[PDB]
Amino acid sequence: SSGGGPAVVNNYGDIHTANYDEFYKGQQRREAQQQAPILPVR
Amino acid sequence: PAADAIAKLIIETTGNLLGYFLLGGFSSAGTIAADIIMPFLVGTIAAWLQWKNTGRATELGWVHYWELYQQGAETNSWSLAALAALRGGFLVGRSETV
C-alpha cells in the first residue's frame, strides 16, 4: 500500500507539491542571518 | 583644520620658533615660548564632536548600544557645520518601520 505511491513520493522528496518562492526566501533568510551581523552600520 | 591646518603649522610655528630663537630660548631655557609645539599636537585639539541622544537613551532604556563613529560624505566639513554633522550622524541608527 504505502510502498509504491504517495508514501514513496514522500521518500522521493519534493517531486510533487513544492514551490520555489518559499525555498528561495528561506535561503535568503539563512544568508541574511549569516551575513547581517557582520555587515557594517555605515 | 581650525587648529592644525598645514598652513598654520608651517607659518605660525616657524614664526614662533624664530621669535623664541631671537629672544634666546635655545641659548638658555629661561625664555617663555608661545606655541612652538603646534606640529606635535596635530589631530588632538578639539578634533572630535560627541553627542549623546538623550531622547534615544530615554526611549531605549538601561540596556542599549553605546556609541557609533560616523564619517560624513565630506570628510572635512564637520568643523564648518558641527550641528549638521551631528544630525547626519544621528540619521543612521534610528527606529525604522517599513
Residue whose entry in the numeric block shows the C-alpha cell 513520493: A9
Q: Please return the burial class of B78, using the count of CB atoms within 10 Å of its CB with bins 0-12, 13-18 and 19+.
A: buried
Q: Given an 8 Å threshold on Cβ–Cβ distance, is A41 in contact with B71?
A: no
Q: Quick one: closest CA in A to B71, which residue?
A: A42
Tell me which residue has cell 592644525. Answer: B4
Specify burial of residue B25 (Cβ count, 10 A radius: 0-12, 13-18, 19+): middle
Q: Which sign does the torsion angle of CA B13, B18, B23, B26 carry?
A: positive
Q: Which residues of A touch B68 (CB under 8 A)?
A: 41
CA distance A42 to chain B (A): 7
Residue of A nearest to B67 (CA): A41
Query: Entry resolution in angstroms?
Result: 3.0
Burial A7-18 (b: 16+ CB within 10 A, else e): eeeeeeeeeeee
B25 and B33 Cβ atoms separated by less than 8 Å: yes
Comparing CA positions, the residue from B90, B88, B39, B46 lying closest to residue B67 is B90
Count other Cβ atoms within 10 Å, centred on residue B21: 13
In order of A6, A32, B3, B21, B31, the CA distances from B18 in angstroms are 96, 62, 20, 5, 13
How many Å lie between the alpha carbon of B4 and the closest alpha carbon of chain A?
28
Q: Give the nearest chain A residue to B93 (CA atoms).
A: A41
Deposited experimental method: cryo-EM
Which residues are CB-neighbours of B50 under 8 A, at least 6 positions away? B67
Give contacts of A42 with chain B, Cβ < 8 Å. 70-71, 92
Q: Which residues of B touch A (CB under 8 A)?
A: 68, 70-71, 92-93
Alpha carbon distance A9, A7 (integer Å): 5
